[PDB]
Design an enzyme around this catalytic site. Structure first.
Site, PDB file in Angstrom:
ATOM      1  N   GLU A 264      39.268  20.836   9.696  1.00 53.29           N
ATOM      2  CA  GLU A 264      38.823  22.250   9.573  1.00 53.29           C
ATOM      3  C   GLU A 264      38.622  22.778  10.995  1.00 53.29           C
ATOM      4  O   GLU A 264      37.943  22.179  11.826  1.00 53.29           O
ATOM      5  CB  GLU A 264      37.585  22.221   8.671  1.00 53.29           C
ATOM      6  CG  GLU A 264      36.692  23.397   8.774  1.00 53.29           C
ATOM      7  CD  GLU A 264      35.914  23.564   7.509  1.00 53.29           C
ATOM      8  OE1 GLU A 264      36.231  24.517   6.829  1.00 53.29           O
ATOM      9  OE2 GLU A 264      35.012  22.761   7.220  1.00 53.29           O
TER      10      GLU A 264
ATOM     11  N   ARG B  42      38.800  21.317   3.495  1.00 56.51           N
ATOM     12  CA  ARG B  42      38.549  22.653   2.904  1.00 56.51           C
ATOM     13  C   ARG B  42      39.818  23.513   2.879  1.00 56.51           C
ATOM     14  O   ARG B  42      40.900  23.052   3.220  1.00 56.51           O
ATOM     15  CB  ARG B  42      37.419  23.362   3.652  1.00 56.51           C
ATOM     16  CG  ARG B  42      36.049  22.766   3.389  1.00 56.51           C
ATOM     17  CD  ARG B  42      34.970  23.816   3.568  1.00 56.51           C
ATOM     18  NE  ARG B  42      33.632  23.344   3.245  1.00 56.51           N
ATOM     19  CZ  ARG B  42      32.659  23.114   4.113  1.00 56.51           C
ATOM     20  NH1 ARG B  42      32.855  23.277   5.415  1.00 56.51           N
ATOM     21  NH2 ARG B  42      31.467  22.744   3.662  1.00 56.51           N
TER      22      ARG B  42
ATOM     23  N   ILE C 245      22.853  16.344   7.226  1.00 59.98           N
ATOM     24  CA  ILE C 245      22.724  17.219   8.428  1.00 59.98           C
ATOM     25  C   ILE C 245      21.764  16.568   9.441  1.00 59.98           C
ATOM     26  O   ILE C 245      22.076  16.593  10.642  1.00 59.98           O
ATOM     27  CB  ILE C 245      22.266  18.633   8.041  1.00 59.98           C
ATOM     28  CG1 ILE C 245      23.362  19.356   7.254  1.00 59.98           C
ATOM     29  CG2 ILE C 245      21.856  19.415   9.276  1.00 59.98           C
ATOM     30  CD1 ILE C 245      22.919  20.690   6.758  1.00 59.98           C
TER      31      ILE C 245
ATOM     32  N   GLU D  42      25.844   8.167  -2.842  1.00 54.15           N
ATOM     33  CA  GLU D  42      25.712   6.831  -2.206  1.00 54.15           C
ATOM     34  C   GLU D  42      26.590   6.781  -0.957  1.00 54.15           C
ATOM     35  O   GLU D  42      27.775   7.214  -1.040  1.00 54.15           O
ATOM     36  CB  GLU D  42      26.068   5.740  -3.232  1.00 54.15           C
ATOM     37  CG  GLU D  42      26.059   4.333  -2.652  1.00 54.15           C
ATOM     38  CD  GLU D  42      26.487   3.198  -3.586  1.00 54.15           C
ATOM     39  OE1 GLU D  42      26.967   3.495  -4.710  1.00 54.15           O
ATOM     40  OE2 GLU D  42      26.354   2.008  -3.177  1.00 54.15           O
TER      41      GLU D  42
HETATM   42  C1  J6M Z   1      26.572  24.550   9.324  1.00 52.69           C
HETATM   43  C2  J6M Z   1      26.731  25.935   8.689  1.00 52.69           C
HETATM   44  C3  J6M Z   1      27.379  26.899   9.653  1.00 52.69           C
HETATM   45  N1  J6M Z   1      27.309  28.313   9.230  1.00 52.69           N
HETATM   46  C4  J6M Z   1      28.300  28.905   8.576  1.00 52.69           C
HETATM   47  N2  J6M Z   1      29.441  28.317   8.403  1.00 52.69           N
HETATM   48  C5  J6M Z   1      30.348  29.190   7.812  1.00 52.69           C
HETATM   49  C6  J6M Z   1      31.702  28.722   7.556  1.00 52.69           C
HETATM   50  N3  J6M Z   1      32.623  29.598   7.179  1.00 52.69           N
HETATM   51  C7  J6M Z   1      33.866  29.162   6.935  1.00 52.69           C
HETATM   52  N4  J6M Z   1      34.764  30.050   6.538  1.00 52.69           N
HETATM   53  C8  J6M Z   1      34.228  27.845   7.155  1.00 52.69           C
HETATM   54  C9  J6M Z   1      33.202  26.995   7.557  1.00 52.69           C
HETATM   55  N5  J6M Z   1      33.420  25.706   7.722  1.00 52.69           N
HETATM   56  N6  J6M Z   1      31.961  27.426   7.739  1.00 52.69           N
HETATM   57  C10 J6M Z   1      29.832  30.408   7.491  1.00 52.69           C
HETATM   58  S1  J6M Z   1      28.188  30.528   7.996  1.00 52.69           S
HETATM   59  C11 J6M Z   1      26.215  29.092   9.678  1.00 52.69           C
HETATM   60  C12 J6M Z   1      25.115  29.277   8.865  1.00 52.69           C
HETATM   61  C13 J6M Z   1      24.054  30.063   9.305  1.00 52.69           C
HETATM   62  C14 J6M Z   1      22.846  30.253   8.468  1.00 52.69           C
HETATM   63  C15 J6M Z   1      22.927  30.469   7.092  1.00 52.69           C
HETATM   64  C16 J6M Z   1      21.791  30.668   6.328  1.00 52.69           C
HETATM   65  C17 J6M Z   1      20.548  30.611   6.941  1.00 52.69           C
HETATM   66  S2  J6M Z   1      19.097  30.945   5.996  1.00 52.69           S
HETATM   67  O1  J6M Z   1      19.284  30.419   4.679  1.00 52.69           O
HETATM   68  O2  J6M Z   1      17.984  30.572   6.804  1.00 52.69           O
HETATM   69  N7  J6M Z   1      19.035  32.583   5.824  1.00 52.69           N
HETATM   70  C18 J6M Z   1      19.984  33.225   4.889  1.00 52.69           C
HETATM   71  C19 J6M Z   1      19.518  34.637   4.559  1.00 52.69           C
HETATM   72  N8  J6M Z   1      19.300  35.445   5.764  1.00 52.69           N
HETATM   73  C20 J6M Z   1      20.553  35.787   6.446  1.00 52.69           C
HETATM   74  C21 J6M Z   1      18.369  34.771   6.674  1.00 52.69           C
HETATM   75  C22 J6M Z   1      18.856  33.382   7.053  1.00 52.69           C
HETATM   76  C23 J6M Z   1      20.436  30.420   8.305  1.00 52.69           C
HETATM   77  C24 J6M Z   1      21.579  30.222   9.059  1.00 52.69           C
HETATM   78  C25 J6M Z   1      24.146  30.679  10.552  1.00 52.69           C
HETATM   79  C26 J6M Z   1      25.242  30.473  11.369  1.00 52.69           C
HETATM   80  C27 J6M Z   1      26.304  29.691  10.929  1.00 52.69           C
HETATM   81  C28 J6M Z   1      27.503  29.502  11.782  1.00 52.69           C
HETATM   82  O1  UDP Z   2      28.738   7.931   3.299  1.00 51.36           O
HETATM   83  C1  UDP Z   2      28.391   8.603   4.266  1.00 51.36           C
HETATM   84  C2  UDP Z   2      28.966   9.874   4.492  1.00 51.36           C
HETATM   85  C3  UDP Z   2      28.518  10.591   5.584  1.00 51.36           C
HETATM   86  N1  UDP Z   2      27.541  10.072   6.374  1.00 51.36           N
HETATM   87  C4  UDP Z   2      27.057  10.843   7.517  1.00 51.36           C
HETATM   88  O2  UDP Z   2      26.657  12.144   7.045  1.00 51.36           O
HETATM   89  C5  UDP Z   2      26.923  13.100   8.102  1.00 51.36           C
HETATM   90  C6  UDP Z   2      27.827  14.198   7.620  1.00 51.36           C
HETATM   91  O3  UDP Z   2      29.136  13.709   7.289  1.00 51.36           O
HETATM   92  P1  UDP Z   2      30.423  14.560   7.588  1.00 51.36           P
HETATM   93  O4  UDP Z   2      30.508  14.935   8.980  1.00 51.36           O
HETATM   94  O5  UDP Z   2      31.613  13.727   7.139  1.00 51.36           O
HETATM   95  O6  UDP Z   2      30.218  15.799   6.557  1.00 51.36           O
HETATM   96  P2  UDP Z   2      31.217  17.082   6.366  1.00 51.36           P
HETATM   97  O7  UDP Z   2      30.393  18.253   6.860  1.00 51.36           O
HETATM   98  O8  UDP Z   2      32.545  16.837   7.082  1.00 51.36           O
HETATM   99  O9  UDP Z   2      31.270  17.139   4.875  1.00 51.36           O
HETATM  100  C7  UDP Z   2      27.569  12.340   9.259  1.00 51.36           C
HETATM  101  O10 UDP Z   2      26.612  12.078  10.304  1.00 51.36           O
HETATM  102  C8  UDP Z   2      28.100  11.078   8.600  1.00 51.36           C
HETATM  103  O11 UDP Z   2      28.249  10.017   9.550  1.00 51.36           O
HETATM  104  C9  UDP Z   2      26.974   8.819   6.065  1.00 51.36           C
HETATM  105  O12 UDP Z   2      26.090   8.326   6.772  1.00 51.36           O
HETATM  106  N2  UDP Z   2      27.410   8.125   5.026  1.00 51.36           N
END
Ligand code: J6M
Ligand code: UDP
Ligand code: J6M
Ligand code: UDP
Ligand code: NA
Ligand code: NA
Lengths: 230, 230
Positions: free
Chosen positions: A35, A101, A159, A210
């Site tokens: 991704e 994805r 996470i 698991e």
């Molecule tokens: C690890 C997640 C990363 N993340 C995101 N990823 C993607 C994504 N889009 C793809 N098309 C592909 C793809 N792979 N990922 C979209 S958004 C992201 C998430 C937050 C975020 C969310 C929600 C809360 S909350 O629940 O606290 N809340 C909610 C209500 N309100 C606004 C206040 C805040 C906080 C922070 C921010 C910044 C990114 C960058």
């Molecule tokens: O069976 C598992 C699968 C994942 N992980 C850990 O869980 C975290 C998230 O995994 P990954 O990056 O693969 O998640 P994705 O966001 O790609 O789904 C990482 O630190 C992995 O090493 C783990 O300990 N055991």
């Protein structure tokens, strides 16, 4: 022959990257398209520089940057998937390309959630869906989906395990919302999409609550059985 | 046979819409693709509703909406040009499709100017150029360009004549900047673009400072001569 296209879907930190890196090593007939957003989350390509900037600005102000982020993430994915499709597995007997994805997760999980959280307004969301319909409507259609199904709690724990500083603020509530959307789309199949073929596409659901990093043979066996049905 | 693609280029209110509406009536072998932004500037299609909203927000806050506007304007154009190319002139002896502006005006005139005015930041501008390179890089390539050349003053006067309330605030200085960019691209041919073929594409420059609505035969004669060279 013809390349089989399989999307790996699941919540944040369900283990998709872990699982596709396991798969890629098991067969010369198996390749993966990681991704783009995942590769933005760390020499730097212009896409990685743009991606790192727009991710940082997203954490600061999602209601300013959601549209710009979602359109670039989806473009980046389509470009990367097409490159693999046109580049790889030409000499393969049973070629399979595993997408980390899909364009459907981009729209129906992430962009949909940002609209629902008022991080995009109606115009931004309608322009995004128009762009998506058209950007797709011109080859990446999936032969199957593998759903890596973990509890929100498992994902919050993973996470924590993965330890990216910017993600430690993500709350359980956000993971629960994304979980509900995955269950609607891939388990209940209640989600209406604009892609008719999707309601028909085979789905393999795998429980990954698991730890599987040293114990994945049963999961891979289910993948090989699933592949033989397509 | 094969459809000839000719872009009509020029500053705001130079008379492009006027000129393409004259051309379309003169031959059954001649069709026009009006500019999407022009049709946004007034039942409503979803594109026109999105377009009207994003234009109004642009006048209010260009540094928030420039990226969203420019990407939707360019998508809308590519969709409209492809539809005409695949829809029209199948039974024509000498088919010509006149584009009201091009994907090159979108990027090298308008989006470039918004970047230069700090209405897009570097990430927005680099993402926009990446998207444009790729969105194009997958048929719309021009056989020639017709440059309708008017003074900034002529164009400011024609904005007054056309009488759209939202445009009456546009100052001479903005028109002068866009004029300089057209002169660099199409007269001096000093503008470097990422589209190699463009430095080679034939250009017909027409002086439209004098009113031509009742007196256009000399302009059309130059168009017919230009067409016979392609
Ligand atoms: C690890 C997640 C990363 N993340 C995101 N990823 C993607 C994504 N889009 C793809 N098309 C592909 C793809 N792979 N990922 C979209 S958004 C992201 C998430 C937050 C975020 C969310 C929600 C809360 S909350 O629940 O606290 N809340 C909610 C209500 N309100 C606004 C206040 C805040 C906080 C922070 C921010 C910044 C990114 C960058
Ligand atoms: O069976 C598992 C699968 C994942 N992980 C850990 O869980 C975290 C998230 O995994 P990954 O990056 O693969 O998640 P994705 O966001 O790609 O789904 C990482 O630190 C992995 O090493 C783990 O300990 N055991
Ligand atoms: C009639 C022109 C419409 N107009 C625009 N069109 C396009 C366009 N893009 C296409 N890809 C295709 C296409 N056909 N058109 C892009 S922007 C537009 C222009 C202003 C605008 C500009 C400059 C000044 S300024 O000189 O006063 N100044 C500058 C320095 N700084 C910021 C302060 C303001 C004012 C206002 C706004 C809102 C739109 C919507
Ligand atoms: O020879 C001309 C060309 C144009 N116009 C007027 O100038 C304005 C702008 O023309 P147009 O809409 O064609 O400009 P565009 O923005 O399409 O270049 C309109 O009110 C036209 O009716 C005119 O009076 N005489
Ligand atoms: Na492999
Ligand atoms: Na005609």
């Amino acid at each position: 022959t013809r390349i089989k296209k399989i999307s790996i879907e699941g919540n944040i930190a369900a283990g998709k990257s872990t699982f596709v890196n396991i798969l890629k090593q098991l067969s010369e007939d198996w390749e993966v398209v990681p991704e783009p957003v995942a590769r933005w989350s760390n020499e730097l390509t212009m896409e990685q520089k743009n991606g790192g900037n727009v991710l940082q600005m997203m954490y600061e102000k999602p209601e300013r940057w959601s549209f710009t982020f979602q359109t670039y993430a989806c473009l980046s994915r389509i470009r990367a998937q097409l490159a693999s499709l046109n580049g790889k597995l030409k000499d393969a007997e049973k070629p399979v390309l595993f997408f980390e994805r899909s364009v459907y997760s981009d729209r129906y999980i992430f962009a949909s959630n940002l609209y629902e959280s008022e991080s995009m307004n109606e115009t931004e969301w309608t322009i995004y869906q128009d762009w998506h319909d058209w950007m797709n409507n011109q080859s990446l259609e999936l032969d199957g989906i593998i759903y890596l199904q973990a509890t929100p709690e498992t994902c919050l724990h993973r996470i924590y395990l993965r330890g990216r500083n910017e993600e430690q603020g993500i709350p359980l509530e956000y993971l629960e919302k994304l979980h509900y959307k995955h269950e609607s789309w891939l388990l209940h199949r209640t989600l209406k999409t604009n892609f008719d073929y999707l309601q028909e596409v085979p789905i393999l659901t795998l429980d990954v609550n698991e730890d599987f990093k040293d114990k994945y043979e049963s999961l891979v066996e289910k993948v090989k059985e699933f592949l033989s049905t397509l």
